[PDB]
Design a protein around this ligand. Structure first.
Ligand SMILES: Nc1nc2c(ncn2[C@@H]2O[C@H](COP(=O)(O)OP(=O)(O)OP(=O)(O)O)[C@@H](O)[C@H]2O)c(=O)[nH]1
Ligand SMILES: Nc1nc2c(ncn2[C@@H]2O[C@H](COP(=O)(O)OP(=O)(O)O)[C@@H](O)[C@H]2O)c(=O)[nH]1
Ligand SMILES: [Mg+2]
Ligand SMILES: [Mg+2]
Ligand SMILES: [Mg+2]
Ligand SMILES: [Mg+2]
Lengths: 428, 5, 440
């Protein structure tokens, strides 16, 4: 339980993977060339978690970049931190997946998957003690969705005792007009229920609504959407990246957050909500970080947590502040809104406090909730799915690559089971 | 909806 | 990578091909001698324009194309014309005797004499490709070559290239410029034969194009050179995503994904704007919001259908030129409010938009104003089936009395081949009806 291997698949995967590395690099004082130039030494204590070391004591991310077209990766390599990544860890094809899960999971992706696993293996042998893997990808396209879930199924086979973690971007019509995304997403969910231990449900419906309503951005861009993801990803992995006591590795986090093997779909929240233009001169009070991080407006998943019950909650606070006051406000929410926490898991809210704050803020709060209300997300997709599948629409793209209707029916069926299971424990 | 990083 | 090979079959196919490749050259700064001063990658290149153009040592940019005709007159003009130097002679393939407006002659009697040579030359182009996307096939529904040879080639290409994409640009017959009484016959035959070999087909109704040239360009009696110049702009719009790229650009294959719910429902409706004269365009500039609205005015449709009496299964907007996300978004909001636009219950209602900043250019001595920004809407509407119905009625009237059927039998076809083609067309209209019905 020391090193983590990071992977990013497809357009969304690589864009947010890149932004994630941009962010934490700045937090750990690593420059684009990989040298360290930071003040505090908290920055280098658990640096070995996400980075490798080299000659000249340069720091190289433990990251594998995957795609079926060269596009986003060429752009990432000439991105800001582009030259930071291990050149050999760029593994791309040319055919593309055409937003097709079948192309990603069964044909065009199968043609490439072996080559990726080779770079995974090479990184996993450099590991003194491997925890597992975090993947970043969208569920709506083809590469990240289809090839991504394939890589998991394959990686679980070589490393079944390791932990499988994902940052999975759920599709929304509010952001994409590709009609088949509900197909791609349902197929992916079936995989994720079975083969991940933890999945952060990053909803593009939420991210768009947040950008448009709260941050008052009338023409939200991907960079705007990703700034929110970047912030969440920094916060959620903070308890992993700096010295801490709670949820300090992926296995422990899983054990605290996952009461049942299938229900591992986490609802992230964050505060204060920030746009890249927003000034944020006035740091928030500890009571303000708390009322917000539990506020639906700050949820990245687009569910109403008041419609379900928290099975478990992690809450991570960053920056210099009164750890005394953190506990009172945290204990306040639990005691105020006690009906929204399940009674049969005592003290299901756990809290950590890291001193180093995120780039550009003095005070930040990140939320990780295993709410049953997450079903609303899966219910949403389920409806967008059936709307088409009842008329067997657009299936020819998939059957043409070798799939069968039955394989859809089972992924439809397995996700409906998921929803019902999240509803079984909401009335307990 | 038209949405570029 | 992702090269695209154009195949121009028959007179309509070839003459439209001329317009198109002249226009592409004006869009990429390519001279009629193939030289391109912008391209610094000499002899090779990875650029967006290389999907339609190969390069040579001399610095010469060469259309990834083939012009085929069963008679030399039309292609001969290409061989001697302004852009003669642009091609290599092996690309311009002619017979001696055409197909005399006979599908049977195009598919069989004359076509068989030249199909091998054409495929040999198509093959030679494919060998220049690092990763071929597929073919674009330009042809008339009504001609004997346009109909019969096209079906033959498409069948042969299915075999030699398996399932690499095959897109059609099909010229649908109009009476104002029809050349044969039997064009309904030829139409139903090629459509049937090609149906399961074509991934996506953009029908161009000549009566629609004749109408728009008359109305929006105040052209008194439109010529082929008139229609072709307008048609080329539309084709350019559709292929723009394949020949240019920018952040806001959406690949045609992505639009294709939305547009085809079932393999047979692969006939999108094109609607283009603005079509405007230089006299009207002077001092009057058209906004993102204005051209977007035109797309839903049936006067600007490319096939005479009525989408209002039909249901929508998809909507794409292929913008080019001075267009920003902000304005497009507001524009569609308007139309979502100001129109009704019924979709079938099983489809979502979002519009897939793409944008190429590269503005529309125009051909010298063209009749179209040089605009700052333009748009092509690709819609999958049940109303497109109207096109089949008009043609199916025309076909029905003649076959009832077996009129003209004898010129076909004499070349080797059977009555069974007719009734069969017509049954596929009936199924297709039925299919296009089945999808409009609401679910349960
Ligand atoms: N828009 C447009 N339509 C054309 C053009 N040339 C021919 N057509 C149409 O094509 C149909 C006739 O088919 P053609 O392409 O001329 O005949 P073909 O393909 O050469 O076949 P054969 O001459 O019989 O061997 C008619 O409906 C014409 O209106 C053209 O240059 N532009
Ligand atoms: N938040 C976010 N979502 C993205 C981005 N790029 C694509 N997506 C979403 O992911 C889906 C498309 O998947 P994509 O990654 O582009 O396909 P892939 O390349 O085959 O994996 C759609 O739902 C998009 O809205 C991005 O940069 N940020
Ligand atoms: Mg893409
Ligand atoms: Mg292959
Ligand atoms: Mg001819
Ligand atoms: Mg070049």
């Amino acid at each position: 339980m020391r090193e983590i291997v990071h992977i990013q698949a497809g357009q969304c995967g690589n864009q947010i993977g890149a932004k994630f590395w941009e962010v934490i690099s700045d937090e750990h004082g690593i420059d684009p060339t990989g040298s360290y130039h930071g003040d505090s030494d908290l920055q280098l204590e658990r640096i070995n978690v996400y980075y490798n070391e080299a000659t000249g004591n340069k720091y190289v991310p433990r990251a594998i970049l995957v795609d079926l077209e060269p596009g986003t990766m060429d752009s990432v390599r000439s991105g800001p931190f582009g030259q930071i990544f291990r050149p050999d860890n760029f593994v791309f094809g040319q055919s593309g997946a055409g937003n097709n899960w079948a192309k990603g999971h069964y044909t065009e992706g199968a043609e490439l998957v072996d080559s990726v696993l080779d770079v995974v293996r090479k990184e996993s042998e450099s590991c003194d003690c491997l925890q597992g893997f975090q993947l970043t990808h969208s569920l709506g396209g083809g590469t990240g969705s289809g090839m991504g879930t394939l890589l998991i199924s394959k990686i679980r086979e070589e490393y079944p005792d390791r932990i499988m973690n994902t940052f999975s971007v759920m599709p929304s019509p509010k952001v994409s007009d590709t009609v088949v995304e509900p197909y791609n997403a349902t197929l992916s969910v079936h995989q994720l229920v079975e083969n991940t231990d933890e999945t952060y449900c990053i909803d593009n419906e939420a991210l768009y609504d947040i950008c448009f309503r709260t941050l008052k951005l009338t023409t939200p861009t991907y960079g705007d959407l990703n700034h929110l993801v970047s912030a969440t990803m920094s916060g959620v992995t903070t308890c992993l990246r700096f010295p801490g006591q709670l949820n300090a590795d992926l296995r422990k986090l899983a054990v605290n957050m996952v009461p049942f093997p299938r229900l591992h779909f986490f609802m992230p929240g964050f505060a204060p909500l920030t746009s890249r233009g927003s000034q944020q001169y006035r740091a928030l009070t500890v009571p303000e970080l708390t009322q917000q991080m539990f506020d639906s407006k700050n949820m990245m998943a687009a569910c109403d947590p008041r419609h379900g019950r928290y099975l478990t909650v992690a809450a991570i606070f960053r920056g210099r502040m009164s750890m005394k006051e953190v506990d009172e406000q945290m204990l306040n929410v639990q005691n105020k809104n006690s009906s929204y926490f399940v009674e049969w898991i005592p003290n299901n809210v756990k809290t950590a406090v890291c001193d180093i704050p995120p780039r550009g803020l003095k005070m930040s709060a990140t939320f990780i909730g295993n709410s049953t209300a997450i079903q609303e997300l899966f219910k949403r997709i389920s409806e967008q799915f059936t709307a088409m599948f009842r008329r067997k629409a657009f299936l020819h793209w998939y059957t043409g690559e070798g799939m069968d209707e039955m394989e859809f029916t089972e992924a439809e069926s397995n996700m409906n089971d998921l929803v019902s299971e999240y509803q079984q424990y909401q009335d307990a | 909806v038209v949405x570029x990083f | 990578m992702r090269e695209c090979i154009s195949i121009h079959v028959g007179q309509a196919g070839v003459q439209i091909g001329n317009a198109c490749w002249e226009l592409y050259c004006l869009e990429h700064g390519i001279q009629p001698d193939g030289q391109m001063p912008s391209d610094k990658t000499i002899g090779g290149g990875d650029d967006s324009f290389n999907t339609f153009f190969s390069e040579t040592g001399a610095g010469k940019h060469v259309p990834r194309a083939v012009f085929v005709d069963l008679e030399p007159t039309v292609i001969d003009e290409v061989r001697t014309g302004t852009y003669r130097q642009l091609f290599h002679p092996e690309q311009l393939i002619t017979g001696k005797e055409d197909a005399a407006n006979n599908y049977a002659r195009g598919h069989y009697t004359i076509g068989k004499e030249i199909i091998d040579l054409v495929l040999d030359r198509i093959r030679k182009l494919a060998d220049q490709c690092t990763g071929l996307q597929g073919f674009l096939v330009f042809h008339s529904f009504g001609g004997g070559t346009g109909s019969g040879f096209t079906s033959l080639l498409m069948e042969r290409l299915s075999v030699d290239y398996g399932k690499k994409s095959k897109l059609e640009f099909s010229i649908y017959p109009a009476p104002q410029v029809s050349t044969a009484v039997v064009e309904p016959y030829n139409s139903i035959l090629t459509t049937h034969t090609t149906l399961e070999h074509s991934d996506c087909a953009f029908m161009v109704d000549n009566e629609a194009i004749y109408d728009i040239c008359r109305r929006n360009l105040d052209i008194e009696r439109p010529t082929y050179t008139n229609l072709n110049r307008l048609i080329s702009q539309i084709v350019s719009s559709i292929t723009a995503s394949l020949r240019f790229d920018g952040a806001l650009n959406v690949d045609l294959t992505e639009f294709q994904t939305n547009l085809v719910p079932y393999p047979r429902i692969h006939f999108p409706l094109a609607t283009y704007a603005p079509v405007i004269s230089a006299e009207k365009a002077y001092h009057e500039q058209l906004s993102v919001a204005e051209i977007t609205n035109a797309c839903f005015e049936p006067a600007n449709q490319m096939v005479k259908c009525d989408p209002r009496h039909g249901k929508y299964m998809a909507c794409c907007l292929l913008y080019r030129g001075d267009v920003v996300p902000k304005d497009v978004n507001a524009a569609i909001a308007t139309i979502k409010t100001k129109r009704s636009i019924q979709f079938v219950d099983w489809c979502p209602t979002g519009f897939k938009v793409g944008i190429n900043y590269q503005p529309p250019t125009v051909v010298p001595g063209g009749d179209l104003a040089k605009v700052q920004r333009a748009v092509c809407m690709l819609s999958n509407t049940t109303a497109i089936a109207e096109a089949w119905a008009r043609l199916d009625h025309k076909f029905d009237l003649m076959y009832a009395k077996r009129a003209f059927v004898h010129w076909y039998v004499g070349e080797g076809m059977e009555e069974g081949e007719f009734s069969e083609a017509r049954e596929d067309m009936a199924a297709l209209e039925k299919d296009y009806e089945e999808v409009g019905v609401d679910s349960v």
